[PDB]
Each structure stands twice: as C-alpha cells, then as structure tokens.
Amino acid sequence: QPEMVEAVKKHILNMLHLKKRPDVTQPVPKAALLNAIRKLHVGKVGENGYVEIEDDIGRRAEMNELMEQTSEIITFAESGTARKTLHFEISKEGSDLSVVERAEVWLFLKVPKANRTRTKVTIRLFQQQKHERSELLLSEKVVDARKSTWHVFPVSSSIQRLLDQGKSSLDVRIACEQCQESGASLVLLGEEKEQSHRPFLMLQARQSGLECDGKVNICCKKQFFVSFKDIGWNDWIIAPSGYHANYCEGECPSHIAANLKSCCVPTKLRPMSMLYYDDGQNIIKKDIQNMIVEECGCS
Amino acid sequence: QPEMVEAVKKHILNMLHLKKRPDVTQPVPKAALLNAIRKLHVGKVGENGYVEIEDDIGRRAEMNELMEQTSEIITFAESGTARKTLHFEISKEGSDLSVVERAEVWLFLKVPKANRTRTKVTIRLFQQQKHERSELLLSEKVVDARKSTWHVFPVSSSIQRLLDQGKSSLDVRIACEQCQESGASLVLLGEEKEQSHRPFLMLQARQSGLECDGKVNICCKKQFFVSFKDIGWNDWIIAPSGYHANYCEGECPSHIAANLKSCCVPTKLRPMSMLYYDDGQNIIKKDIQNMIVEECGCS
Ligand SMILES: [Cl-]
Ligand SMILES: [Cl-]
C-alpha cells in the first residue's frame, strides 16, 4: 500500500513534468489565493474555503461521453393511407435508446398570399392507434398564419410512450380547419418545388468493460481513490480533493486461435484538471489528458 | 488494399452497431434533407450541397487537446527592493510554454472614502530592466477612482518578449501621481486585512509518438485516409467526406530487463461524429468515441 501510493505519486509528478513535489513553505495567504482564483475564474470557492475548478476539462469529458451516448434521428414522413395522414417509420436506433431527451414534429405552413385576418390557427396532431381505432392527441398548438414558415410541435413524452410500448411506427392525422380561412395550407407531402418543405419528426434520445471484483485473472479495472489529504499532498494541491487512480490488471488471451499478443490496456481514458502550487508564489491550473482510466480491455 | 478497405468498412459498421451498410434506395430528396439538417442545426450546408456537421464532437476534442496544451499561471508579487516596486518570479512552467496567449497584471485600487472629483487616474507599470538601468513601459492605463476595485493591465506582448528572452524574472515599478488626489492608494503588498488584495500576474500560455515512415518494426501509427466517395459509401454517409483510418503497427519490447508483455496500442484517441442514412427515411447524427487514432505507443 505505501508502494502503491508512491507509484501514484510518481505518476502524478510525471504527468505534471515535475521531478518531485514542491518543497514545503509558507505559501501565499489563503485570502489572496482565493480572491485571485475567484477573479480569474480559475476556481470557484464556497465558504469555509472549499475549492473547485471552474473550467474543469473532466466535466467537458463527461459531457462528451453524454454526446457519445446520445443519438439524433430525423424521420421523414411517408404518405398515409388516409387523407391528411403521415406515416413515420422510426429507425431501430430509437429502439436501442431508452431515454427520450426530446422529440419534435416539424410541419411547414405555406401561406401563398399574406393574410392578417384570422392571424392564428389551431393545428392538431392525432396519433392513430388501433385497439378498433382510437386517436391520441399528439399535439395541440396555436400558430401564427401571417407568413409561410416552419412550425415545431413538441412530442417528447408521446414518443417516449411510443418507444416504451416497443413500437417505432407512428401514423399522424393532422387537423387545421382554420387554415384555409387564413389562406394557409400544411405541406404534408414535400412534392416537387415544395419538396424542401417535407415534414419530419426529430428525435434526440439517450441510452440508459470489466471491473476487478472477485474476477481471478481476467482483464479489469481496479478502482483506487486516493485523497491528497491522506497522503500529505493537500498543501500544494489546491484542487481537487482526491484522485481516482484506477488501473488495468489481468492477462489477455492471444490471437493464436497483425499482432498475436494481447495486453490488458486502458480503452477509455478521461482527462483531469489540477490546481496546484508550483512553489510558494506560483499557482498553476493545468489540464492533463489520459489521467483517469475509465475502462480496461484486451488489445 | 481491398482487404484494408473491407477492414475499415467492418470497423465503421461495428462502431455504428450495424450488421451491414444500408441497402441502396431512392432516398429522401436532397432539398428536404438539407432543409431539415439546416433547421435542426444538425448540419451546416454551403451552396452546391456540401455538408458539414454543425455540432462536431471531434472539434470539441481538438478544443480539449488545446486546453491540454495550455497552462494558466498565477504569480503573486514579491516586495521589491525599491519603493513602489513588485517582484514577480514566474514559474519554470512558463519557460516550457512557447506561445503567450494572454497575460494580465491585477492591481487593487483602494479608495477608503469615495471621491468623484478627479474621477480618473493614470496608472503606469514600468518593467525595470538592466543593461545600466532602463525602464520599459509595461502598461499605461487610465482607470476610474470612484470606488475600491480591481484593475486589469494587459501585458501579453511584453511577457511574450520576456519569455522569448529566456527570462522569468520581472521587476515592476508602479506610478500613480494622481492617486492620492482621488484619495486612492494601490495595494502593492497584500498585508494583514488587505492580504486578499495582494497584486498578481496571470499568464495563460500554450506549448508550440512515432508515425510509420520508414521505421522497420518499432511501434508507430500508419495513416490511411479513406474517402467515402472512393469506396462507394458516399450515398448513405452524408458527412464527413472521408475517414482518417490511422492504426497501430509494430512490436514492443517487453518489461523483462505487473505485466511483462507490451503491445503497440493506441495511446491517444479522438471521437468522430457521423451523419448518415440508416435507411431511405431515417437520417442519424451520431457521436462515436475512440474512432480516430491520433497516437500509438507501447503499453
Ligand atoms: Cl512526498
Ligand atoms: Cl459495401
């Protein structure tokens, strides 16, 4: 365990391009430090003097991973069998994704000649479900019918319910009895010169690698969190409080049945930002790549 | 070479969770597509129909790497030997970094009793250089002396010149003859209850792994760019135009003089976003992690 701590310490020093940790010294007073990192927006400070890094690159990494778990699907409407009906055949991708972050229906309201009278019209979207036939109110929206424009119909929860039912098919009847009064018309089939006005459904959805537990020799990640306070480094390391020193252990079966050998290797790496005294007078905010191992696998 | 293309194709399909590429079909008309990805801000379109991804996760990755090459240094002033002089001993970190992105001097103007008369005072910062003694005008700034507040003195180019001269020492004489007229005083030594007003210099600076060239067997990255147009995939792949299929080749010396074996392994991975037809009706924008290999090394 002391050897592990020494190893982690050497690792940190190497990534910071330091030959050793800074000598102890009476540093710049804490008030000065906090004020400086506050004004430069380097570190946000709560009361009692707890410091977090304001522009943490690790948070950006987590955000990127969120994007990596998120897919955006554009489904163009197919003509329905009935009048004023659209068919949406959502890709199987949406079935793999569990959480519906957002879903919109885009319909283009075409107003050939501008009309101020009856400025606003009520558009309704009915999901045609069977078991014989009943209609769900997908969306009831009041829109402006002054000029030709796109209109957006939020249908998040309804698409969520649809996917939860294990379905990716969606037939939509559209109703707008006041539309022609305003001299307006909903482009339901993007045909010919109005083909750039073909309606569509947008769907942004999320989806929601061994760790060493009791696994004997297989390639896995051992989690070893080490607080800087416990290893006597919290004097020159301002932030964060600790370091997730996860590492890859185990052996990997070869390609014997390119390269034959296989190694237990970090397959998922996360960057980490640090705020520290380089000496008694110099505080450094630094962003280090490949600092934290998130997953291990066989090469 | 056809086997390499097949390998890349299989790789892409695997990362997209597809068993094979989508069957050809008469897709949704290009006008509809472009309009849809434009309105949803999924893909920016120039004329002639060239498509780029608007929220490319790869660009975010490049930005993160820029942060990983950038350090921010806070140097607190030490008392000079002369009157109204501050000494800045910049960390050696700044010497490693070549490009000075920005540098500021923060000085706190303390106005005990508010004074509207002589609203503005001229503060000058003189860098005291020798070879006997001459003074450079670091900064000449006109500031408001109504209330006690911080003032920021841009010194980017001057700190750049200092670092270019291979020096990290900086003595600054400060002049403000109009300050006491306005009942103001520059906190030069953050002492006692004014210790949170200790002046400081901020410095944000940048710094500015084998590739297979003719290296026989050492671990390196082979660069293989493949355009989707040339491999007949540009019909269902809307963006980007091609794929940097870089890969790791070579052998790695062992740890014989943990794990003994070492493998040529991607040490630096970059994520890539794709915009593609899942079928004739469904366009998917997806962000894939660990898609592009940027560097290879021995594990
Ligand atoms: Cl130590
Ligand atoms: Cl093919």
Number of helices of chain A: 5
Structural class of chain A: alpha+beta
Q: Give the number of DSSP strands of chain A.
A: 19
Number of structural units classed as domains of chain A = 2
**Main sheet record of chain A:** 5 strands, antiparallel
Portion of residues in beta strands of chain A equals: 35-45%
Question: What is the compact description of this entry?
Answer:
Chain A is of the alpha+beta class and 299 residues long. Chain A is 16% helix and 41% strand. In chain A, strands 3, 6, 9, 11 and 12 form a 5-stranded antiparallel beta sheet that branches. Chain A has a 5-stranded antiparallel beta sheet with strand order 4-5-10-7-8, with no helix packed on it. The first copy, chain A, has a 3-stranded antiparallel beta sheet with strand order 15-18-19, covered by helices on one side.
Question: What does this 3D model show about the protein?
Answer:
The structure is a homodimer of 299-residue chains. The radius of gyration of chain A is 29 Å and the shape is elongated. The first copy, chain A, is α+β, with helices and mostly antiparallel strands and 299 residues long. In chain A, the strands form 6 sheets. In chain A, strands 3, 6, 9, 11 and 12 form a 5-stranded antiparallel beta sheet that branches. Chain A has a 5-stranded antiparallel beta sheet with strand order 4-5-10-7-8, with no helix packed on it. In chain A, strands 15-18-19 form a 3-stranded antiparallel beta sheet, covered by helices on one side. The first copy, chain A, has 2 domains: 2-66 and 210-298, Cystine Knot Cytokines, subunit B (Ribbon), CATH 2.10.90; 70-206, Jelly Rolls (Sandwich), CATH 2.60.120. Chain A contains 5 helices and 19 strands. The complex binds chloride ion (2 copies). Chains A, B: Residues 1-208 form a propeptide. Chains A, B: Disulfide bonds join 212-220, 219-264, 248-296, 252-298. Chains A, B: Glycans are attached at residue 115. Chains A, B: It comes from Homo sapiens.
